[PDB]
Design a protein around this ligand. Structure first.
Ligand SMILES: COCCOc1cc2ncc3c(N)nc(-n4ccnc4)cc3c2cc1OC
Length: 276
């Protein structure tokens, strides 16, 4: 039953990383489009990434939620590993943030809520993403989110992700917890509303300075209830972010006033607000 490269008509490159290329592919027998992640074995071995690639495949096998990529299949030839992933027709969330500048309140609320549910599911399984960002939050043809890129993930019984979204505890204890994803969630909300990430600067080092000093500002037009929520996520003490277990988990966070009108139980059956 293993699939093979010949079973597909490969098309355009969707994305490139240091250790992988994601290519759109149309399976011949079915007409189905998959986003196939291709990784060269030699380069993985050379750079000691075997544990990272193994962990990524293992974590993805365990994801069975409409808000996360799905691993349909894997195979390999002599030089390469192939992971068959769900194809997110409408691409990165980042693209929409730039096209429209910033989201109105209805949109921010709806998409934030979906990210929260996704995180609730993910953290429920003791998995931490460690690199959450609009680049990693994809939109499929229905405009529901699909979170991907699990090569940096950690399974709870070393790293640093993208500078703008790195939490203080990572720059301090070199540590990482569910809270780290929640910090990143705080930045993404800020970004949906403001149009830009909260911590900006000329280089990695300057960005890290602002992060540890909690140096950022809210624009005046920022939705008040959204601001309050952000202030309860962008908290230096990881032990005091809305959503973390020390703060008693996702119940209080979902009960936040910003999510007042949200029906949490069937988000992926709701039709997303039109993005304008
Ligand atoms: C605008 O419409 C074009 C569609 O663009 C895309 C569709 C995707 N559809 C699906 C993915 C998927 N399952 N995984 C990853 N990815 C990135 C790291 N590791 C995995 C990436 C994509 C992916 C990336 C894409 O461009 C950035």
């Amino acid at each position: 039953r293993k699939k093979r490269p010949e079973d597909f008509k490969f098309g355009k490159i969707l994305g490139e990383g240091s250790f992988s290329t994601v290519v759109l592919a149309r399976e011949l027998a079915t007409s189905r489009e998959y986003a196939i992640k291709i990784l060269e074995k030699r380069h993985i071995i050379k750079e000691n990434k075997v544990p990272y690639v193994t962990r990524e495949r293992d974590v993805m096998s365990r994801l069975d939620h409409p808000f996360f990529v799905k691993l349909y299949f894997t195979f390999q030839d002599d030089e390469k590993l192939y992971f068959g992933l769900s194809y997110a027709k409408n691409g990165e969330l980042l693209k929409y943030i730039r096209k429209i500048g910033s989201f109105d309140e209805t949109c921010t609320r709806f998409y934030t809520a979906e990210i929260v549910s996704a995180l609730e599911y993910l953290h429920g399984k003791g998995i931490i993403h460690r690199d959450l960002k609009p680049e990693n939050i994809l939109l499929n043809e229905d405009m529901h989110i699909q979170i991907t890129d699990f090569g940096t993930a950690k399974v709870l019984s070393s790293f640093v992700g993208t500078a703008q979204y790195v939490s203080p505890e990572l720059l301090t204890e070199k540590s990482a917890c569910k809270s780290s994803d929640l910090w990143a969630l705080g930045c993404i909300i800020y970004q949906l509303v403001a149009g830009l990430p909260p911590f900006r600067a000329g280089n990695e080092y300057l960005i890290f300075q602002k992060i540890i000093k909690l140096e950022y500002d809210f624009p005046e037009k920022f939705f008040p209830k959204a601001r309050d929520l952000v202030e309860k996520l962008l908290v230096l003490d990881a032990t005091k972010r809305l959503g973390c277990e020390e703060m008693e988990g996702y119940g209080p966070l979902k009960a936040h006033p910003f999510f007042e009108s949200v029906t949490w139980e069937n988000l992926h059956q709701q039709t997303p607000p039109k993005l304008t």
